[PDB]
Subunit: 178 residues, 2 copies
């Protein structure tokens, strides 16, 4: 509760379960990556861009969730507006996806991996598009369920976007490279 009067063991016991749920969920990514071992081995450069893609997804979603949590608190939006938020946000995500995808493809050209120009460009557009929706809809789901985002919203978006982020990336990679 009160940090100034909490000891190491006390803080450890207060924080541990939430991180443990997050890592147990987090391990699924390693299972997904093992299933794509052949493309990873065939083209080593595929591994180079996993953090940037997943990270850009998580940034997009947490920016998205932060706006929605704000609009819900100020009663600017209500829970019935999730149909409207969804339809508008898939426009914003397309725009953000193409924009950021343009930058990252330029980095792949600089690195000189022509086989990965379509793989990365397609993936980030889809990753940003989908991570944007996940961020926008979590505040609605949590509020409908009596949960306050502060502790929960940010790592939930990050972990969701990592799994859906890999699933998109390696699938596009398996398709275009094999």
């Amino acid at each position: 509760l009160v940090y100034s009067e909490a000891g190491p063991v006390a803080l450890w016991l207060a924080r541990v379960r939430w991180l443990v749920i997050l890592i147990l969920t987090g391990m699924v990514t390693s299972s997904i990556l093992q299933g794509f071992e052949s493309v990873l081995e065939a083209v080593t450069a595929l591994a180079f861009y996993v953090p940037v893609l997943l990270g850009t997804g998580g940034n997009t979603g947490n920016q998205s969730a932060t706006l929605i949590i704000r609009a819900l608190a100020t009663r600017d939006l209500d829970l019935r507006d999730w149909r409207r938020v969804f339809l508008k946000e898939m426009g914003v995500g397309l725009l953000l996806g193409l924009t950021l995808s343009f930058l990252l493809v330029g980095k792949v050209y600089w690195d000189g991996h022509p086989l990965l120009l379509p793989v990365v460009g397609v993936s980030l557009v889809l990753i940003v598009f989908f991570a944007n929706l996940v961020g926008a809809m979590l505040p609605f789901l949590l509020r409908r369920l009596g949960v306050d985002p502060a502790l929960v919203s940010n790592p939930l978006v990050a972990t969701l976007s990592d799994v859906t982020g890999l699933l998109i990336y390696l699938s596009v990679a398996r398709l275009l490279l094999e």
Copy 2:
């Protein structure tokens, strides 16, 4: 400003630069992975655990910062309390590191990469330990610096923990595997 009366283009134009700043910073991770291409080549399974390790780092650090941002706002702590938070938090981080390390090491055994058991296990302890300190100190650093931690920290911790997290993991990889 107000989400309900902003259109897709307005929403994109208002969000784009911050995401663009984040991805240009994020590209450093790909350069780092390229500098370790040989260790990536030596053991394909190394790539399998990059999202989990970096993801667990970001979770730990953002949990830590949220606690500190709370204590500073409710003024249980002020900016001068930073040495004690540091000394206390390196106890909490060690405990959190050993705990999550035990879980992730168990997953590496399940995946059947005995050769990677010490590399991953050691790396997660270091990643959790340092990311926990980073989270606790940014609210102190940001406030002393005329920045409000609340608005920026969450993607800030995520990007720091990805770079430092990659640097720890791959370095441990050459030391034990090369």
